[PDB]
């Protein structure tokens, strides 16, 4: 399932590491 | 889970996008910096009657004064305002500008077109000149983020867009600034009936 980034709040698939938009690395 | 939208404010510098996102009180007090890209992520929660929606607002830092937003700006974003100022007919000259960079990184995406500061009294973009939006999609409102004037307007033709219902209502107004100007009863009636003359032509 995928995440929502805690830095910029977009939905991101649950493949990414880091976020797609604000290169924040999932917690 | 929260039904929510990443919402993509912008338009050339001085057009008042800052002013505008920030009359939602709650967004204001709930928002979220992004450092590495320079930007403020508003969450403005609408109470809808069919539930709550949530626009995250991505608000710039200033950066848009020189040159075109990066791409990790506009990505992912579901819905977009595009807003110029009535005040400096550049601003809208700049318009087909930032629908371009905004369609060529997301598509046929729901876009408000708004023309903020019509509040002030001598106003230079009048209705007639707005021709823009009639082509692409593109829904119009005049605002005045300062006297609250049509606030909620962009948000309701994007939620009934982006949700696929046609009678979608906001149960309650948000929370917002109380007015920092007066938006006149009488302009805001003129220029209500102004773009009406005007979408018939
Ligand atoms: N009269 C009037 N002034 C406004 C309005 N919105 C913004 N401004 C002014 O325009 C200037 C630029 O606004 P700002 O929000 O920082 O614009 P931004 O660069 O697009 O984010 C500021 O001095 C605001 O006070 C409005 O609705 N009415
Ligand atoms: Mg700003
Ligand atoms: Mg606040
Ligand atoms: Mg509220
Ligand atoms: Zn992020």
Redesign the pocket.
């Known amino acids: 399932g995928t995440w929502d980034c805690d830095t910029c709040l977009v939905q991101n698939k649950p493949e990414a590491v880091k976020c797609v938009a604000c290169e924040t690395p999932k917690p | 889970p929260q039904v929510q939208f990443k919402l993509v404010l912008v ?1 050339d ?8 996102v920030k009359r939602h009180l709650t967004g204001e007090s709930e928002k979220k910096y992004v450092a590495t890209l320079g930007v403020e992520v508003h969450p403005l929660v609408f109470h809808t009657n069919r539930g709550p929606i949530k626009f995250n607002v991505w608000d ?1 830092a ?1 950066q848009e004064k020189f040159g075109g937003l990066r791409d990790g700006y506009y990505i992912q974003a579901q819905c977009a305002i595009i ?1 110029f100022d009535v005040t400096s007919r550049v601003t809208y000259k700049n318009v087909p500008n930032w629908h371009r960079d905004l369609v060529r990184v997301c598509e046929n995406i729901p876009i408000v077109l708004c023309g ?2 019509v ?2 009294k001598d106003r230079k973009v009048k209705a007639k000149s707005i021709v823009f939006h009639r082509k692409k999609n593109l829904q119009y409102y005049d605002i ?4 609250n004037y049509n606030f909620e307007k962009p948000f309701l033709w994007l939620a009934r867009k982006l949700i696929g219902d046609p009678n979608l209502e906001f149960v309650a107004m948000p929370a917002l600034a109380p007015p920092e ?1 007066v938006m006149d009863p009488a302009l805001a009636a003129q220029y209500e009936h102004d773009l009406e003359v005007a979408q018939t032509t």
Do not use: E, L, Q
């Open positions: 338009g510098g001085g057009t008042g996008k800052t002013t505008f710039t200033g807003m903020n500061k509040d002030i005045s983020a300062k006297s100007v």
